[PDB]
Amino acid sequence: GELAAIKQELAAIKKELAAIKFELAAI
Amino acid sequence: GELAAIKQELAAIKKELAAIKFELAAIKQ
Amino acid sequence: GELAAIKQELAAIKKELAAIKFELAAIKQG
Amino acid sequence: GELAAIKQELAAIKKELAAIKFELAAIKQG
Structure with a gap:
């Protein structure tokens, strides 16, 4: 439930982390 | 509750990552 | 403890976030 | 299990942020 x-x-969070790394590689 | x-x-932390993301695309310009 | x-x-984590937000603030100062 | x-x-995630924080410090140097 809460779990x-x-x-x-x-x-x-694992979503945002994936997208951040993709940006990081764009740079 | 603790949970x-x-x-x-x-x-x-989720939303913070979000902000960080938008700040990262700015840098690409 | 586990908890x-x-x-x-x-x-x-909140501590790496802080570090990260520093580099960004830095980056956009140069 | 879940817990x-x-x-x-x-x-x-922590390990992931630290990685990302070395990343930014580097790019900071462009």
Whole structure:
């Protein structure tokens, strides 16, 4: 429940991390 | 709760990463 | 503790974020 | 399980941010 909410946040974060690294490589 | 608290901290970190992302594309110009 | 170690990891992350936001502030000053 | 992996999941992210922070410091030097 709360654990689910949490896992979903981690996922979102792994999303932003992927996109940041893609930007970083653009530079 | 401890967990809700944790989710909450994670949300904050999420949004922060978001800001960082938009700041990163600016640098590409 | 495990809960404790978790809270430590969060603090640690918030600490890299801080570092990162510094480099960005720096970068756009040069 | 879900819980037991969390400590690991955070740590990884931490390792990821540090990597990214070395990245920016470098680019800072262009």
